[PDB]
Structure formats: structure tokens, C-alpha cells
Design a protein around this nucleic acid. Sequence first.
DNA 1: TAGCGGAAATTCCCGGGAATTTCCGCT
DNA 2: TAGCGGAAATTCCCGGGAATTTCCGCT
Lengths: 273, 273, 273, 273
Amino acid sequence: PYVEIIEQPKQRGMRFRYKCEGRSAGSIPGERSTDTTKTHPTIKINGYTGPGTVRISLVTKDPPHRPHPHELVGKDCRDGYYEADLCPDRSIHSFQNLGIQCVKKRDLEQAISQRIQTNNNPFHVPIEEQRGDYDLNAVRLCFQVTVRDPAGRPLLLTPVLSHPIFDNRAPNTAELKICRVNRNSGSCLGGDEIFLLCDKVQKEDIEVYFTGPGWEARGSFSQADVHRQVAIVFRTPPYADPSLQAPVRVSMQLRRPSDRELSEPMEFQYLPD
Amino acid sequence: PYVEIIEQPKQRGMRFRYKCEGRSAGSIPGERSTDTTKTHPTIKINGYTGPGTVRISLVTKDPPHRPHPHELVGKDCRDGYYEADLCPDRSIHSFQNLGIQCVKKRDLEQAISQRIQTNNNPFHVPIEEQRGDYDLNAVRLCFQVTVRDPAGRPLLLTPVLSHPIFDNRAPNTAELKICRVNRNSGSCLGGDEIFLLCDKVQKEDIEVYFTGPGWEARGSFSQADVHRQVAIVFRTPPYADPSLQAPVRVSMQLRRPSDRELSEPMEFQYLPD
Amino acid sequence: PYVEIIEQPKQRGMRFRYKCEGRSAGSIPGERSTDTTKTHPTIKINGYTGPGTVRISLVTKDPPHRPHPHELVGKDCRDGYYEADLCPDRSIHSFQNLGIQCVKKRDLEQAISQRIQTNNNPFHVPIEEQRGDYDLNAVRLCFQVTVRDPAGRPLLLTPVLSHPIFDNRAPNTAELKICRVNRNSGSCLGGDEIFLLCDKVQKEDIEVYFTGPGWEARGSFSQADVHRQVAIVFRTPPYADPSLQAPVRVSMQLRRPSDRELSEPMEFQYLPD
Amino acid sequence: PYVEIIEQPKQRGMRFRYKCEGRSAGSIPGERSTDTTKTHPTIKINGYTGPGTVRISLVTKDPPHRPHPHELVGKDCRDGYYEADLCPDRSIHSFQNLGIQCVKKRDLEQAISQRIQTNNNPFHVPIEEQRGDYDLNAVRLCFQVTVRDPAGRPLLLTPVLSHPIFDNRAPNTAELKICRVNRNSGSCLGGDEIFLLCDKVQKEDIEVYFTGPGWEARGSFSQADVHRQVAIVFRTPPYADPSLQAPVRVSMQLRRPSDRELSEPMEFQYLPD
DNA sequence: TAGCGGAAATTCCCGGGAATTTCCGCT
DNA sequence: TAGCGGAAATTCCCGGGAATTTCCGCT
């Protein structure tokens, strides 16, 4: 039998809370999970449907997957990992009680110690190679399931990894979102100053991406146009049709060239001169 | 000798009062307990009809029937449980004094201790499993009859559980019902704002469920769209066919993902653009 | 010399926090104090401008002004009252560190004891008459100033009382505020159903008040149109002009006939049939 | 003999560095200093010009000048205070090595103890009043000069206080400055949306202040209009005359009601409808 | 040099909104 | 009477946004 992540965790959005912060109920939202309803990381067990055990731990993002320092607070959680009995009912299993607790650099060494001192190494990585530098800005979920063979003897399935979950605090991995704009319409020739407010962004890695029917332009602005990483004053690019008859509505949104990530689309109609 | 439940306790309809509400507290009614006539939880002992004693305690409604924190107040009750000597000349015994006194979360920890300290564990469940989260909104009656073996010495019979009993106090148990709506018709494309008023609901656990001929959509709204748990402003979802000729009437209703419960259906016709 | 309250405290808005709640920095906002900038209770001293002392305490709302049970937490506060040296600079004195801490009924008797046991009776009321039933839903600020005569001898001025301050708990005295509306425009003839959501209100004492250029109408709705005190479905009244040429924007807001109180105004434009 | 402050320290500008921050030592400049001519806090002793010693400590900016928790780092400093022997052949003494090292809230309690343990109390304020709340964003320099009486024995002179010194990095006391604006002109009737970007500001304590010939209005915006404390979207207020013939240029700037501080003025011309 | 100043890396705190207790009408 | 039920009066809690510490560029 093998494990399958039918419901991946939301890669962006939530921010790793610290131990000091009076938080713990925090739960990793499902990939789908919308503002209306939130889904939760779910895995399916193909080839089995009886009693068993499931352990969830955190690992590095890069190929060398070592026990990540951050802990995993929540229900059935201890020493940084999740571990509860598997429900014999069906092969479907979802988790809504998974909270990520990022540790401080001071307690970085101590964190990694408990990992192996508690034997929380899912990929059995050499203690020599695991040591180095960790990216406390992103993590991965490691589903370690253990079922039973036809006879009833423990059967440890092959560990599976989920898509990386970044922390919503770093302007580079954080989620892009436009909050407000001074105007949502301009000449088809462009050149109209736009004051849009958004979330923390990298002025050396961000851009106003315009899209439409097989078309795509970009906002004009130098790094000096990004105010405190939350505001961008740019100029509207000229529309494909430098002389349209009627107004045309296109989609505007923030883009991050690094990981070619996009923000939520925003309606923007072009007006003829 | 075995114990048989003749009259199960009424499932729901009665909330779990606090110690402070004793002044206006009640007793557990019978299953088939009408209002004109009153019946109470009754059991039957077959294979013995002489001297003996009965112990009634409260356990969880889940598989691991652990000692429930709530207490069982009433005549012949003590330390959260009931216990007395049953008629040595009757095989059927009814109980019309049993009362459920829910404990406060603050005194919940000690409550479990008292359950163990007095050996109120009828299923001999390891204390290791008696520290997790308990469902303070449901309970099961555990009848522990002790007769006298064919010789004359005490003979504890196999414990018998009753049906789950839930109190109306529980927030997520309230019945779903739509009271009023601003409009009952909209474009087949959806997107029409709907102001519906209903009863107390969980903004983190509720949704506008649309149904029809092998079809089902959902209303669009964030938690911030639920006003004081009695009003929900949402957008109508796009019907199956995004371009119907004539109007189509579907069923709309509130749904609670937790227990997949539904409210009373409401007629809603879709209109072509 | 006499004391003058040039800056009364906001009668409604803030809610008395309990001792358990991790709050204390709470400060009574000035009567003016808007969302932008907040003013603070200020008093002017006419006939004096040198060194002195000022004590602020809480008293009953009704004529029999007795030491109110609630305490006054904040800077220079002890035993439930405020007392700091008066600043010789000028005759103006404002307080932004005044926080109200409401006590529980259990500690009601104990609260009143400390009042007189600490001799915090500003109006010297007979211990016999002060005892009775207290109102924990409203209080008054008692400014007890003590200056110096031309010679330099202590001069206790006449205590002054500030307007009542009710807790935003009870609707009749709570603050009125419209949260959301299905539409903000209708025919000049009126009759358009309006679904507005607001805060707790008295269905027997509330009304949708329309205002404009020397004009004022009212929403139409029976008590049965008020859903759980937070929603009101009413009909728009016919605007003064029964046939205007262009749209006219008027102000809409909730009104409470009891104390003729109003909520925040809301823009509403009338449209010709 | 008395001490006189010749050169007061600059109030704004410099910010309090913590123990961790080393590189930027810091040196309190004189209020009458410039880039071309750096001046520093200077005092003058009149009535003596021989041997002696000077002690400089930090006290609160409020009436009860208690020993401030912050330390005074720099040359000839120790235990939060400065102290050295001044030139026995000069009546004027300047200090260009004084630095303010703010302490952390965690070590704030002990800091006060150190102040007392070393008798760093120049105003002999009872330790009873040295436990309340502290404003660690403002401080006053307390010059404690000790000369030699006409005889030759030590003679402590009356302590002299300086003007306050505010922490530039302190949010509530930082410098106000408008960086960019979407438009600098609008109708004399007002109501034009303005997107202005500035530095860190308190959304609960900030306002767009308009001024002119014996006139002054204010921008309209709720706290929800302040984006990440660096952007404010407000509406232009109506000018003194709602129907002017020609354009009128007034001054616009940020204002902070707390300390009624202002930002650099900005030209803004009003245009007739 | 000595710093300034922007930005991450920790910690805190408040406005609400609810759930949790308690109290009291009303058959 | 016996209980429903509803409101109160208390207590919790979440989302944020901030603040506070610390870091490091850069000249």
C-alpha cells in the first residue's frame, strides 16, 4: 500500500507563529480552502482501510530533507510532530489541527537536537550532512504511515512529502495581494499614474502584470517607486490597441519574477483617448 | 445473568444543567416518554431476581468509553455516579431521578481525577487515554449491575451502555432554519447578492447549499459575511447550464459541514440572462 | 475657584472590561474623540493656575450619587480612584489614562466596602442610604480638585460630576451603528425593501431615520420586521420630492426615540421613477 | 555658584540604541548644531572656576523627575550615568560623548534597582513612587555639578534639568513627513480622494491638517484608511470659501494630536468647481 | 572613522466576536 | 409544583495589526 496526498496544504498565506505568541489553535489550511470554507491536508491510503498509525513531521524544502527545526503544535502533537491512531473507517484522513511553531535562531541548535534525540528523522539522514544551514522560511510535511499486513503485522509504508509551506512574513515567499487602488481605468495609450497598496513585497523583485486576450503588458516604475514595500506608484502601459472604439476590461495583478508567482486578479478597463 | 435495557433514555431535548441550575434542573426522560404520560430509563435483569445493587455512571459516546467528567446528580447519587439496591423481588427496574450536571472547563481536570480516584471506570480504560479532549456535549449511561452468583457471593454482570444523550446547550447542535430572504430568483450565471436571515449558526461551520437534478452548488461568502450568527450575505453560484432557455427552480438551504446537517429546503428559481 | 469639564467623556462606545480580562490600558475617550483622533476627559480650573491635587472617582448615575462599585484602573490609580498632582503649568488638565474596571456581583459587597473603607465618598452619603441596588451598566466621573488659597493653604473645591457613561452591553443604552445594507438607492416614491444589519437594538424602540435639506422621513416596518435585534427589514419612505429630475443623496441612520440618539449617518441617493 | 545650560541637547533626531547595537555609539548633539558645525550639550558654572566634578544622569520628563531606567553610555560613563572632573580653568563645559542606551522591558525592573542601589536619585524621590509605569521614549538630562565651597570642601550645587530628548525610532514620537501624493489640487468643495505616502504613523493618532489665511480644515478618513502606517487615503475638506473665483494655494501637512506635532508643509492649491 | 538608517527577527496587544457560566421568566 | 426556554452576566478567544528587539546593509 502507498500514501497519497489528496489534499495538499496551502503553500502561502499563513505565517509561522512563535512560541511566545499566545497561539496554538493555528491550523494549516488545505490547498483549496477558500475564504468561505477551509479544506485541510488530507491523505488517502490505497490498498488498506483498517487500523493503523500516522506520524506527521516537518522537513527541509531542498532535496536534502532533514528534520526541520520548527515544531508542529496541535492535537496529538508532541516533541514537534503529530502522531495519532489511524481511523479504520475509511482510507481518507484529513488533519485540521496542524499548527506550525517556528523556533528562534537562539534555540536553533537546541531544536535540531530534540529532533534526533527524539528520533524524528523520517528520511534517515546522516547527522553529518543534516548539519549546516536551515531555511526557517519554508517547510514540508512528511506523512509517515504504518498499517497492518493481511496477517496483522506492522507495515511501515513509504514516507510521502507534501508541497512546501512558506511563511507569510518574508516579502519574497509571502503571498501577493493588491489591497487598494486610486483608479481602475485609464487611457488605452497608458501613462496614467497608479497608486496601488499591497502587502510586503521585494522592490527588486515585483511587477504590475497586465493580462488580457492573448496580451500582456507591465507597469512602469523604478525601485524608488516602491514605498515601504507596501505601496507602488507606477504608470499604466499602453494597450495593444492604441486606438480602441469602446472600453476594454483587462486583468491586473502583482507578479514576482523569482517564482513567477501572481496575486489575485483585478478588473481594469481601458478607455479610448 | 445479563442486563437488558427496556426503556432507553430520551436522546436529545434536554440540556445539561450546571450545579447552579439545580434550582431548575431536571431528570432524564424515557425514550418513548410522551408528555401526557412519563416513562423513565428502565433496565431488566434476566437470570436473577433476588438481592443486588446497581451502579450507573457516565461515559463518552465514542468507542473508548472513558469515565465522563460530568456528574450524575439525583437521589442515591454520589461522586458523579448513581448507585443503590434494587428490589429483590422484581426483574425490571426503572430510574426516575437521574440528572446530568455538567461540570465547568475549569474544574474539568480534577473531575477526571475524581472519576479515577473513586474507580468510576467501568471499561478499565488506561488512564493514559483519560487526558485527551472530551466531548462535553454528549454522554452514555453505563449500567453496572451486581447480583449474587448461584452460591450467594457478589457477581458483577457485564456492563451495558445506553444510547448517546446530547444536551441542547451545545452551540453546534442548534437546528438550521432560513427565516427570510431579500430575493428568491437570480441569473443562471449567479453573482447576485443574497441577504438571508436565519437562526444562530457557526460562521466557521455553515454554508448555503444549492441542489437540483443531480446538481449542487454553494453560496459564496467569507466569515465576515455572517452578521451576528443570524444573517448571511452571500453571492449566488452559477447554475449548471450557463445559458438555460426557461427558468429552473432549485432547492436552497443551510448546511453544516460538521454533521452534514441541513435546514428546511427553500424554492429558488434560476433566470436566464 | 471652580472646576469645569471642558471635555466630557464619551457616554457610549467603550465596554467595561473585567478584572480577569488582560486589559488595563483602556482609556475613556473624550466626548469629541473621533475614529481619526481621540480626545480625552479634560477639566479647566477657573480662578487658579498653580500647584494642587486632583482625585477622580466613580459614582452612581441617579441623584443619590454613592461611591460606585466599579474601580478606576490606570495611571496614578489605586483602590479604584485616580489621584495625581495637578500640573501648575496651566488651568487645563486632560486625562487619557482612565480605565473603567467593572466588578462582578459576587464581589459587589466587597467592592462597596473598600469604597468607604478607603473613604472614597465624594458626596458624603449616609451609609444607610448608599446601600441598596446598584446599576453596573452606567457610571459618572467625580472630579474632586484641591487647590491653594492666596496664602498657600489647602483649598478643596466643590466636586463636579461628568455626564453618565453606560456600558455598551445593554441595547437601550448601547451605541447605534449600521453595518451593512442590501442597497443604498431607491425610487423617490419609496417602498423599496431594505435589508440593513446593525448592532443589538430594541425592536420596540428603534427606527430608520432619513434626513436631508430641511426634510426628514422614516422607514416603515413593524416589530416583527426586526430579526434578533441585529437586522431590520423595512420599506423606504417617499422622498419630499415625489418627482425629482436628477438623483438626490440624503442621510440615513438608526434612531432611538427613547433618548433620541442617532447612529453614524449613511449616504443614500434617491432615484426618480 | 549655580549651573546654567548654555547649549541644550537636540530633542528630536537621535534614537535610543539598545545594548546589542554597538557600531553606532551615538552622541547627543546641541540643539543649535548643523552639519557644518557640530555643537554638543554645554553647561556653564557661574561663581566658581576651579577644581570640581560633574555627574550627568537620566530622569523622567514628568514632574516627579525619577531616575530613568535607560543608561547613559559613552566616555566616562558607568552604571547608567556620566561622571568626570571638569577643567579647573574653564567655566564652560561641553559634553560630546553622551549616549542614550535604552534598556529592554525584561531588564527594566532591575534597572530601577541599580539606579537606587547606586544612589542615582538626584531629586530624592521616594522609592515608593519608583515602581509605577515608565515612559521609556523620553528622557531629561540632570546635570549634577559639585564644586568647592569658598573654604575648599565639596559643595554639591542645585541640580539642573535639560529639555526632553525623544527617541526617534519610537513610533508615537517619530518625525512626521509626507513623501508622495497622487494630486496636489482639488475642488474648493472638497471630497477629492487623496493617496499620500509618508513615514510610520499611528492610525489612532494622526491627521491631514490643512492651513491658510486664518483658516484650517482636516482630511476625512477612518482608521481603516491608513495602510501599514505609511499610506493614508483621505478626502479633501471644503475650503473656507465654497465658491472662489481664482485658485488659492494653502498648506497641507500631517499632524499628531498627541503632541500636536506637525510635518513639513506642502503646497496645495484649491480650484473652483 | 563613526555612525545612519532600512530591514528582518522576536514579542505584544486590541478590537471585536463567541463560548461559557449564571440568572430568571414562564408553563 | 416540575421543567422548559430565554435572556443575562461572565469568561474566553480569534484575527489581525502593531510593537519591540535585533540584525545588517551602506557611507
